[PDB]
Design a protein around this ligand. Structure first.
Ligand SMILES: CC(=O)N[C@@H]1[C@@H](O)[C@@H](O)[C@@H](CO)O[C@H]1O
Length: 578
């Protein structure tokens, strides 16, 4: 059918983001999306997807052993799923209850045996995606026994033991996956542009097929999340048409290309891009541009970034409005390469864009914005739909969040000109606004805030689904306390909410949580980590307000660091309806 593991994973991500609640729906969902296949095809494809990228086939025996085992888990989970489905339909039935207990044990036992075979020495990287899939399924099944095990007829001692497995393995699987993500990525680095392409492709593909899934693992903790919980992925992934459609390779450019990506920041909303046009020998091109953005929820004035590339005057400037409908979901770019037989300042090599169509995500339809012309270098090939059952403009997975630029040469004095817009893509689960649901546990990442004082945004470890907020120590200045404020919106004004914060700290730290002007928590929270530099899964802890309140307290939430000597990492705010 022409599908790749990337398509499949994005679809699974969509599911896990919107349907993360225990019950038959979840179990049947996993069968429908991943585990309902017959035969080795899918699994082979999952392996090839990473193998072809690192340019290394898994040793043949270990490869067949892994594929074979995945087939086994598939058959077994299909049976488990149907037993679950019939059981839910008739929960008091003793025969169904006994069958569930047997099915759970077989499933748990098979997964525990199978997993190390997806961690074979010297082949951890190409086996990573199937590992994560298996790990996901295992956590899922452990979550199921935690929620339903009593009703199935397991004793309290067995349930608690399985739950302790769940919490430990949330940690272990996460750390394993991130470690091997980092290792694999690092191996793929090289000095030239061809290397950078491969490196970024790895980052991109494994973000979509590994990291994105891992980021949702904490959700399986049924005690922490006893009802439906909605996560948001704020991380950005990258395409670059000029570089990615280039068959040659720019020597020693990789570092420069990588630096052209912007550094960690509070999430913004891309409003417009103003493109400047330069020309050479009747070839008109995108020479530079200017970005305009807004804070999350349009909760502040629009801001303008410094000029990217060079301001050319060969044609009038074109202001492309990105923020219409759901925003820009797709770029279709026209690449221009000039490689003349004789090269000189009068006859330059060009590696640029001479057109781009910017297509909008929309429930209906909306005409595309077009810089000069459309092209065939299509972002949808790299950033596919999460839902392939509707048109791409409805079933898209990402939204254009920024455009920066890798640049080389000056038109006036160079033989070779590179102008390579770097397109940055945010997952659509990163909503324009912070909207607190009334019937589910709403997760709002701290980086979705709009005001940060005595602190900085730092790179996530890779398992949080985006970046993190670091509040600095005050230096014993009551006026210099680190503060992050998040704008929030309540569609329901009568629902009562407890506010939970997910954090990391090396020493005990006094934190103050405000909802509007009201302080709803002010106390010392324990240390959770040994280091803030090398973050592992268990380094993140939780604390929460004692009481529940309504939207009448206000439309902001914040955390203040009262410590004079220690810093603290804020991951996300969570709103729990009582
Ligand atoms: C006495 C006190 O804590 N003052 C805080 C200050 O520490 C800082 O957080 C600032 C950021 O806006 O807000 C002030 O209200």
């Amino acid at each position: 059918t022409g599908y790749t593991p990337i398509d499949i994973s994005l679809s699974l991500t969509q599911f896990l983001l919107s349907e993360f609640v225990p019950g038959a729906g979840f179990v049947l969902g996993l069968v429908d999306i991943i585990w309902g296949i017959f035969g080795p095809s899918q699994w082979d494809a999952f392996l090839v997807q990473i193998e072809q990228l690192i340019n290394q086939r898994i040793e043949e025996f270990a490869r067949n052993q892994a594929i074979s085992r995945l087939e086994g888990l598939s058959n077994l989970y299909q049976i488990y799923a149907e037993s679950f489905r019939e059981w839910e339909a008739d929960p008091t039935n003793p025969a169904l209850r006994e069958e569930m207990r047997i099915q759970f044990n077989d499933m748990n036992s098979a997964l525990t045996t199978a997993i190390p075979l997806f961690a074979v020495q010297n082949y951890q990287v190409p086996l990573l995606s199937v590992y994560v899939q298996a790990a996901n399924l295992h956590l899922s099944v452990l979550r199921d026994v935690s929620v339903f095990g009593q009703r199935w007829g397991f004793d309290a001692a067995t349930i608690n033991s399985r739950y302790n497995d769940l919490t430990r393995l949330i940690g272990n699987y996460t750390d394993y996956a991130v470690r091997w993500y980092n290792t694999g990525l690092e191996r793929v680095w090289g000095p030239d542009s061809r290397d950078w392409v491969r490196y970024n492709q790895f980052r991109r593909e494994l973000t979509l097929t590994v990291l994105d899934i891992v980021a949702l693992f904490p959700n399986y903790d049924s005690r922490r999340y006893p009802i439906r919980t909605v996560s948001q992925l704020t991380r950005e992934i990258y395409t670059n048409p000029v570089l990615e459609n280039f068959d040659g390779s720019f020597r020693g450019s990789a570092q420069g290309i990588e630096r052209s990506i912007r550094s960690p920041h509070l999430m913004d909303i891309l409003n417009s891009i103003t493109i400047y046009t330069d020309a050479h020998r009747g070839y008109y091109y995108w020479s530079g541009h200017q970005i305009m953005a807004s804070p999350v929820g349009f909760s502040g004035p629009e801001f303008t970034f410094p000029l990217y590339g060079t301001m050319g005057n060969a044609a009038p400037q074109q202001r492309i409005v990105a923020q219409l409908g759901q925003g820009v979901y797709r770029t279709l770019s026209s690449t221009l390469y000039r490689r003349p037989f004789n090269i000189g300042i009068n006859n330059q090599q060009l590696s640029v864009l001479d057109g781009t169509e910017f297509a909008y995500g929309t429930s209906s339809n909306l005409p595309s914005a077009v810089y000069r012309k459309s092209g065939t270098v299509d972002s949808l090939d790299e950033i596919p739909p999460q839902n392939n059952n509707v048109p791409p403009r409805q079933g898209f997975s990402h939204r254009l969040s920024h455009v920066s630029m890798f640049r080389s040469g000056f038109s006036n004095s160079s033989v070779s000109i590179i102008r390579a817009p770097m397109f940055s893509w945010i997952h659509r689960s990163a909503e324009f606004n912070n909207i607190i649901a009334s019937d589910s546990i709403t997760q709002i990442p701290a980086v979705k805030g709009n005001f940060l004082f005595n602190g900085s945004v730092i790179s996530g470890p890779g398992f949080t689904g985006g970046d993190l907020v670091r509040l600095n120590s005050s230096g014993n200045n009551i006026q210099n306390r680190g503060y992050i404020e998040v704008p929030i919106h309540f569609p329901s004004t009568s629902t009562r909410y407890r506010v939970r914060v997910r954090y990391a700290s090396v020493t005990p730290i006094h934190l103050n949580v405000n909802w509007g002007n009201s302080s709803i928590f002010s106390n010392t929270v324990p240390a959770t980590a040994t280091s803030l530099d090398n973050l592992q899964s268990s380094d993140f802890g939780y604390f929460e307000s004692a009481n529940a309140f309504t939207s009448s307290l206000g439309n902001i939430v914040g955390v203040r660091n009262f410590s004079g000597t220690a810093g603290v990492i804020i991951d996300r705010f969570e709103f729990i309806p009582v």
